[PDB]
C-alpha cells in the first residue's frame, strides 16, 4: 500500500523583518587595509541576523548572515580595552559571545564562548530577555523576567575568558526593564524595576544593584518603592559637574521622574501632551529612552507611545544651589521605535518596532534650554504643556529608510506564475507587491510594425568610439535596420528581402549578415554607407539552416550535407574558407559557439533527432553525445568570466530548458541541469550585467526566464514583464546599467532595465520628510470571478472610520469621477470583511462592524471610464463579532462566536438561510475554509480544527472528525479533500489528515445518514464514544501528518498548483512578523532520503566539529562552533511539538555557504554521492520546485 506520509520541504524565501535587537560595535574591517571606526550596526530578528554599515551617511547591507535556528532574546555589543564583537543571548540559555569574521570570500559569524544557562526553551527563569553590558565592557549581565539574575565578569587575554557567573536570586520579584549605568571603572551598577509576583496589592519598586569587583558579588543598594504606574529606567551618565552617586530616569505613564541612588534628589517633570488627543487617549508612557553626551552637553531622547521624541538636559539652578534640574522639550518626533542608537557621527539610528528602521543626522538639535515657553523644568513639578505636532520635520532629517514589513496582517497571491505577493504597508499605508520575478523597468518604448521574430544589437562600425550602435530586427519576409544614439533613435543596402538567420561583428569595423539564401560581408564606408566586400552561397544554392559566430570566427550550417567554417584574416579584413567536409552525418539542427573571445574551442552542434554533439576546434572531433527528449529548439554556448566554466545552455522544444557543465580539454557533457518553463518552443539570448560584472541568458517563452549564475549558484527566474519576444543588452548615454533593448510578443519594441535579482538572501523585490498614514490597514480581498482584482480595506486610529481601495492591473483605480483613488466610510469599522458574488453578474462587499452589524455593499468597475463605485445596500444586525466568513455556493458562509450561520440574499436586508450549532467544545471561530463547497474546516481560539460537511435537504453542516490535541489556529486552508493546513498563534505550522477509516465511510456513504440514519462504525469507534465521549464525540480523529515550527505567526496560507510553472504544487505562507515560506511536497522517496540525510548531517555538524577538535586535542573551537548557538536543529524546530514528516530545507541551505574543507569534511559520513552532487540536490529546490 502507498504510504501517504506527505513530505514537506520548508523554505524561508524572505526572512523575518521585525528587528528586535541592535548593537553599535565595529565588527569587521572590510575594503580598507587599516581602518578603525565605531560607525556600524548589527541588527537581529530572532533567527534572522543582519549587519549594516553607514560611513557614507547612507545605510548599506554588509552581509546577511546564516540562519542561527534559535530565538535571539537579546543582543548587545561589548567593547573591551580591539575588534568589537557582540554578546548574544538566545534560547538554550547559552550566553554566546560571537565575533563577525571574514573567512574565505565571505563574512561568517564565529562564536567564541557559549555559557550554558537554564535550559533550552523560552522561560521566565531563563536568564534572557533582559541583557546589558557594562559600557566599558568589563562585565556582561543577564537577568530573568522573574526568578534570578546572573552577571559574568568578562576578561580578555590571548583567548577570551568569561568569569564564573555571579548569582542573585529573588523568588517573588518579577524583573522588568534592565538598565545599566555607566561608570568610571569605580564599580559596575545596574538598575531594575521589580514588580512583586505574590502580593495583595500591586507594587512596582525600583531597585539598584552595585556589583562589587572587590567582593565579587552583586549588592542590593537602594530599594525605592514607586507607584505601580512605573514603566522604564534610563541611566544618567555622571552629573559630575552638578550635585559615586548615579541618577536614573524612571519613565512613568503621564509624567517622568528621576531618582538619586541615595534618594536625596527625586525630580518629577510632567510629560507634555498633544493638542488633538484624538479619541481614545491613554496616559501614554515613554517606550524608549537613550543618552548622548558631547562637549559637557549631555541630552537624552525619550519617545512616547505616540512617537513624540523628547530630550532632557540638566541645569544646576545656579540661583538656589548646584543641584540637578530636568528639562523636557519637543523634537521632530518619529513613528514608534523599539530602540535608538547614535553613532560617534551625528547619525541617529531609529529602529522602529512598527515597520521600518531609518537613520538620521540631526542639525537643529532642538530648542535651547533658555526658552521658558516650550520647555518644562523641575522648578514646578505640577504643570502641563500642550503642543501641536510638527510634520514640517525641522530638527531631524531622514537619510536612509529600510523597507520592511514587520506587521503584515493579510495578503493575497497575485500573478500566481511569478509568485507575486500583494500586501499592505502598515504605517505608510501603500500597496506593496513583493515579487519573485526580476524587477524590470520599462522606458521609451516604441511601436514596431507587426509580425516580428528576432533581434540583435551590434556596435556601429561606421562611427568609431561613438555612441551610435546598430539595432537589427527581423521579419519572416523582411529585415529592418535601425540606428541607435543617445536620445536619438533613427531608421535607415544590406538585404531587406530575406530573413536574417544571424548577424555579427568581425574583428574591428566589420560586419557579416547571414541570411537563409546567401551571406553578406559588410564593411563600413563613410557615415551612412556600407559595402559588401564578398558574398557567399551555401553549398551552391540551398537554404541555410543555422549560423553561429565568435568575435573573429564564424560557422554556418546549410541544409544537410556540410558545415562551413570561416575566420577573418589578421592585420586586415577578409574571410577565408577551409577545404574539408564536416558532413556531421545528419542534418544539423542549430549551432552554438562562444562569441565572447576571438577564438572559441568546442563548437556545439545540435541534431533534429534530439541529440547534441561536441566539435573539437586534431581539429574537429565528436567527443560526446546527448540524447535528450524533443528536438532542440535553440541553444547557446557561454563561458563565464569568474570561474571560467564553459556552460552550454540548451533550450528545447515544448518548453524544457537545460544547462550543461562543459569541460574545456575533454569537452565532456556533465552536470545536467534542467527545468520546465511554460509551454512553447523556447528562445535564448545572451546578456551581461552586474547585479561585480555578471552574465545571464534570457529565455523567451509563454513566460520570460533569465538564467543567471551567482557565485557557485544559479537560478532561472521569471521576469516582471508578461512576455518578451527577443532580448539583447543595451547601452545609452542616458544612464544605462543592466539596461536592455527587447520586444514584447505583441511585436512592439521596448527598452527596459532589470534591477534586483532573486538571490538566496533576498529572492524578492519590494514594489511599493516623514510619512505616516492615520489609516492602519485591516484585511485584503480579491474577487473570485476576476482572476486577480485586489480590494483593500483599512481602518482609522481614532473615531471609527474605514477606507476601501481597489486595485486591478497596474495601479489602483479612481473613485467615480472624483480625484481620490480610495473611498472613505464614516462610522464604519471593520472587524472582518469578505467580498461575495450572489449572482454571476453582480458583486457585493461584506463588512462586519464592531457595532455588531453586517453591512452589504456593491462594487462597480467603470471600464474605460474605469473606476470603482461602491454602493451601500442593506443593514443587518449580528449577534457575534463574526471573526470569520467566506464564500459558500451562492451564499455567505459566516461563523458566529458559537455557531455557523449561512446567509442567503434577501432584499432590504440579508436572510439566514441555515444555522448550524457547533459542538460544545468550540467557543469561537478564528478562521475557517471550504473544500469545493462540500466540506469545511472550522478553527477555534482555544481548541483545534473540526471538519464539517454540508448536507443538502438536511440544510446543516455535520462534523465528521475532531482534532487530536488543543491547537490555537490563526489561519487554515485545504490542500485536498482529506487534509488541512493550519498555523498557530504560537508559531506551529501543521497539516492534518482524516484517517482512511473515515475516508472509506464518507466515500461510501451519503452525508445525510451521518446525523441520523444507519452508518455502521467498527466496534472500536463506539466503544470510544461511550468510553471517551469528550474526545471522540466527533467519532474520528486527525492523525498528525505534518508538523513544523516557524517562530513567526503565519497570517496567510495559499496553495498554488504551480510556482512559476513548476510541477510540484507548493503552499506558501506569509507570517505576521513578516516572512514568506513554502512547503514543497517531495515526489518519490530518495528525494526525501537524500534531503533527510543532509539535514541529519548539518544537524549535529557542530558536534562533529567538536569531536574532531576533541580528538586532535587528545593527540596534542567550542561546541556551538558551526551552529553559533547552542540550539540543536531537531530541538529548535521541534519545540512545541516534534516535527513529523517535514524536513527543514532552511538548514540544508546553510551547507552551501560552508567552505569546501568543511563541506567535504561533513559529507564523508555518507557512502552516498559527493559534495558536488549534494549542492546539486540542495540548489535543485529553488530552481525546479519554484
Amino acid at each position: 500500500a502507498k504510504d501517504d506520509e506527505l513530505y514537506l520541504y520548508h523554505l524561508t524565501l524572505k526572512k523575518q523583518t521585525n528587528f528586535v535587537h541592535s548593537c553599535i560595535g565595529h565588527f569587521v574591517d572590510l575594503e580598507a587595509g587599516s581602518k578603525r571606526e565605531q560607525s556600524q550596526l548589527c541588527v537581529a530578528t530572532e533567527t534572522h541576523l543582519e549587519l549594516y554599515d553607514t560611513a557614507d551617511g547612507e545605510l548599506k547591507l554588509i552581509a546577511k548572515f546564516q540562519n542561527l535556528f534559535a530565538t535571539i532574546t537579546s543582543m548587545k555589543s561589548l567593547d573591551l580595552p580591539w575588534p568589537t564583537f557582540l554578546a548574544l543571548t538566545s534560547d538554550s540559555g547559552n550566553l554566546s559571545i560571537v565575533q563577525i569574521i571574514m573567512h574565505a570570500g565571505a563574512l561568517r559569524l564565529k562564536t567564541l564562548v557559549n555559557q550554558p544557562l537554564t535550559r533550552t526553551t523560552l522561560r521566565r527563569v531563563s536568564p534572557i530577555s533582559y541583557m546589558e553590558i557594562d559600557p566599558n565592557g568589563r562585565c556582561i549581565i543577564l537577568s530573568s523576567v522573574e526568578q534570578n539574575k546572573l552577571c559574568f565578569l568578562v576578561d580578555y587575554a590571548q583567548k577570551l575568558r568569561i568569569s564564573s557567573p555571579l548569582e542573585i536570586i529573588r523568588p517573588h520579584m518579577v524583573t522588568l526593564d534592565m538598565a545599566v549605568v555607566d561608570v568610571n571603572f569605580n564599580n559596575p551598577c545596574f538598575v531594575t524595576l521589580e514588580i512583586d509576583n505574590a502580593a495583595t496589592q500591586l507594587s512596582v519598586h525600583l531597585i539598584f544593584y552595585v556589583l562589587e569587583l572587590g567582593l565579587n558579588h552583586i549588592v542590593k543598594k537602594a530599594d525605592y518603592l514607586v507607584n505601580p504606574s512605573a514603566n522604564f529606567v534610563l541611566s544618567l551618565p555622571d552629573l559630575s559637574r552638578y550635585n559615586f552617586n548615579p541618577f536614573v530616569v524612571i519613565g512613568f505613564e503621564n509624567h517622568i521622574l528621576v531618582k538619586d541612588m541615595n534618594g536625596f534628589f527625586s525630580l518629577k517633570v510632567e510629560i507634555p501632551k498633544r493638542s488633538i488627543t484624538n479619541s481614545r487617549h491613554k496616559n501614554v508612557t515613554i517606550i524608549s529612552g537613550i543618552v548622548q553626551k558631547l562637549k559637557n552637553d549631555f541630552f537624552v531622547l525619550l519617545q512616547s507611545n505616540h512617537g513624540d521624541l523628547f530630550k532632557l538636559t540638566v541645569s544646576p539652578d545656579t540661583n538656589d544651589r548646584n543641584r540637578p534640574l530636568v528639562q523636557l522639550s519637543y523634537f521632530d518626533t518619529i513613528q514608534n521605535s523599539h530602540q535608538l542608537h547614535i553613532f560617534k557621527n551625528g547619525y541617529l539610528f531609529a529602529l522602529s518596532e512598527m515597520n521600518n528602521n531609518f537613520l538620521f543626522q540631526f542639525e537643529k538639535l532642538g530648542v535651547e534650554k533658555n526658552d521658558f515657553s516650550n520647555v518644562l523644568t523641575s522648578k514646578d513639578p505640577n504643570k502641563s504643556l500642550v503642543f501641536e505636532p510638527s510634520i514640517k520635520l525641522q530638527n531631524l532629517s531622514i537619510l536612509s529608510q529600510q523597507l520592511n514589513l514587520n506587521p503584515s496582517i493579510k495578503s493575497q497571491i497575485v500573478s500566481d506564475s511569478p509568485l507575486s505577493i500583494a500586501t499592505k504597508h502598515f504605517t505608510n499605508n501603500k500597496i506593496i507587491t513583493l515579487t519573485n520575478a526580476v524587477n524590470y523597468s520599462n522606458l521609451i518604448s516604441t511601436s514596431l510594425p507587426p509580425n516580428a521574430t528576432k533581434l540583435w544589437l551590434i556596435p556601429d562600425p561606421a562611427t568609431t568610439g561613438d555612441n551610435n550602435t546598430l539595432l537589427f530586427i527581423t521579419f519572416p519576409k523582411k529585415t529592418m535596420i535601425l540606428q541607435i544614439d543617445n536620445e536619438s533613435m533613427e531608421e535607415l543596402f544590406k538585404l531587406s528581402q530575406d530573413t536574417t538567420i544571424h548577424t555579427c561583428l568581425m574583428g574591428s569595423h566589420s560586419i557579416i549578415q547571414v541570411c537563409t539564401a546567401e551571406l553578406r560581408h559588410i564593411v563600413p564606408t563613410g557615415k551612412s554607407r556600407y559595402s559588401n566586400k564578398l558574398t557567399w552561397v551555401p553549398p551552391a544554392g540551398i537554404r541555410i539552416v543555422c549560423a553561429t559566430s565568435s568575435k573573429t570566427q564564424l560557422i554556418i550550417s546549410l541544409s544537410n550535407y556540410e558545415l562551413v567554417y570561416f575566420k577573418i584574416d589578421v592585420s586586415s579584413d577578409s574571410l577565408i574558407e577551409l577545404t574539408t567536409h564536416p558532413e556531421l552525418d545528419t542534418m544539423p539542427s542549430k549551432v552554438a559557439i562562444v562569441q565572447d573571445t576571438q577564438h572559441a574551442d568546442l563548437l556545439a552542434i545540435a541534431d533534429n533527432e534530439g541529440m547534441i554533439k561536441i566539435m573539437s576546434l586534431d581539429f574537429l572531433t565528436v567527443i560526446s553525445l546527448q540524447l535528450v527528449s524533443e528536438k532542440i529548439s535553440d541553444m547557446i554556448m557561454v563561458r563565464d568570466s569568474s570561474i571560467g566554466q564553459l556552460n552550454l545552455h540548451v533550450g528545447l522544444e515544448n518548453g524544457v530548458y537545460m544547462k550543461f557543465h562543459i569541460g574545456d580539454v575533454d569537452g565532456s557533457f556533465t552536470d545536467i541541469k534542467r527545468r520546465f518553463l511554460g509551454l512553447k518552443p523556447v528562445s535564448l539570448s545572451y546578456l551581461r550585467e552586474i547585479s561585480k560584472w555578471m552574465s545571464c541568458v534570457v529565455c523567451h517563452s509563454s513566460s520570460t526566464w533569465v538564467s543567471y549564475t551567482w557565485k557557485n549558484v544559479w537560478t532561472i527566474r521569471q521576469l516582471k514583464d508578461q512576455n518578451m519576444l527577443s532580448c539583447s543588452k543595451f547601452v545609452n548615454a542616458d544612464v544605462a546599467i543592466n539596461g536592455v533593448c527587447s520586444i514584447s510578443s505583441s511585436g512592439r519594441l521596448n527598452i527596459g532595465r532589470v534591477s534586483n535579482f532573486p538571490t538566496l538572501d533576498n529572492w524578492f523585490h519590494v514594489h511599493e520628510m516623514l510619512q505616516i498614514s492615520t489609516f492602519r490597514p485591516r484585511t485584503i480581498l480579491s474577487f473570485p470571478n476576476n482572476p486577480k482584482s485586489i480590494l483593500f480595506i483599512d481602518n482609522h486610529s481614532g473615531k471609527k472610520q474605514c477606507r476601501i481601495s481597489l486595485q486591478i492591473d497596474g495601479e489602483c483605480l479612481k473613485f467615480g469621477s472624483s480625484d481620490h483613488l480610495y473611498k472613505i466610510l464614516d462610522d464604519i469599522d471593520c472587524v472582518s470583511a469578505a467580498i461575495i458574488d450572489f449572482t454571476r453578474q453582480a458583486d457585493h462587499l461584506i463588512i462586519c462592524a464592531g457595532d455588531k452589524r453586517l453591512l452589504t455593499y456593491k462594487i462597480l468597475v467603470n471600464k474605460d471610464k474605469l473606476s470603482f463605485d461602491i454602493e451601500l445596500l442593506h443593514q443587518t444586525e449580528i449577534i457575534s463579532p463574526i471573526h470569520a466568513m467566506l464564500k459558500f455556493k451562492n451564499f455567505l458562509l459566516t461563523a458566529m462566536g458559537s455557531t455557523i450561520v449561512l446567509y442567503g440574499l434577501g432584499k432590504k436586508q440579508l436572510l439566514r438561510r441555515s444555522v448550524t450549532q457547533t459542538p460544545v467544545s468550540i467557543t469561537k471561530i478564528v478562521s475557517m475554509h471550504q473544500w469545493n463547497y462540500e466540506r469545511l474546516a472550522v478553527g477555534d481560539i482555544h481548541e483545534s480544527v473540526t471538519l464539517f460537511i454540508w448536507d443538502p435537504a438536511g440544510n446543516v453542516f455535520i462534523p465528521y472528525v475532531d482534532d487530536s490535541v488543543k491547537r490555537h489556529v490563526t489561519v487554515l486552508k485545504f490542500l485536498d479533500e482529506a487534509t488541512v493546513i493550519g498555523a498557530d498563534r504560537y508559531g506551529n505550522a501543521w497539516t492534518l489528515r482524516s484517517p482512511p477509516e473515515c475516508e472509506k465511510i464518507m466515500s461510501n456513504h451519503d452525508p445525510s445518514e451521518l446525523s441520523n440514519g444507519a452508518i455502521k462504525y467498527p466496534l472500536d469507534v463506539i466503544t470510544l464514544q461511550q468510553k471517551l465521549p469528550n474526545t471522540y464525540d466527533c467519532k474520528f480523529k486527525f492523525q498528525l501528518l505534518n508538523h513544523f515550527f516557524v517562530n513567526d505567526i503565519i497570517t496567510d496560507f495559499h496553495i498554488l498548483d504551480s510556482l512559476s510553472n513548476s510541477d510540484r504544487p507548493g503552499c506558501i505562507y506569509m507570517g505576521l512578523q513578516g516572512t514568506v515560506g513554502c512547503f514543497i511536497p517531495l515526489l518519490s522517496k530518495g528525494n526525501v532520503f537524500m534531503m533527510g540525510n543532509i539535514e541529519n548531517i548539518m544537524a549535529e555538524a557542530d558536534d562533529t566539529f567538536y569531536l574532531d577538535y576533541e580528538s586532535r586535542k587528545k593527540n596534542n573551537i567550542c561546541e556551538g562552533s558551526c551552529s553559533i548557538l547552542g540550539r540543536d536543529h531537531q530541538e529548535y524546530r521541534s519545540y512545541y511539538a516534534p516535527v513529523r514528516k517535514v524536513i527543514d530545507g532552511d538548514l540544508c541551505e546553510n551547507f552551501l555557504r560552508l567552505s569546501l574543507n568543511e563541506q567535504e569534511f561533513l559529507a564523508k559520513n555518507l557512502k552516498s554521492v559527493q559534495v558536488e552532487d549534494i549542492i546539486q540536490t540542495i540548489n535543485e529546490v529553488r530552481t525546479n520546485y519554484m
Binding site: 432584499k907 432590504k908 436572510l911 438561510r913 444555522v915
Partner: peptide, 27 residues
C-alpha cells in the same frame, strides 16, 4: 431537555421557513 425565508414584500426577511410555507399553501 431562526431561519428567514424572504417573503415577496421584502419584509419577510424576518419571516420563518414554515410560516412562508404556510403562505405558500395560502398563496
Amino acid at each position: 431537555q431562526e431561519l428567514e425565508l424572504e417573503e415577496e414584500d421584502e419584509e419577510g426577511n424576518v419571516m420563518s421557513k414554515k410560516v412562508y410555507d404556510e403562505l405558500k399553501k395560502q398563496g
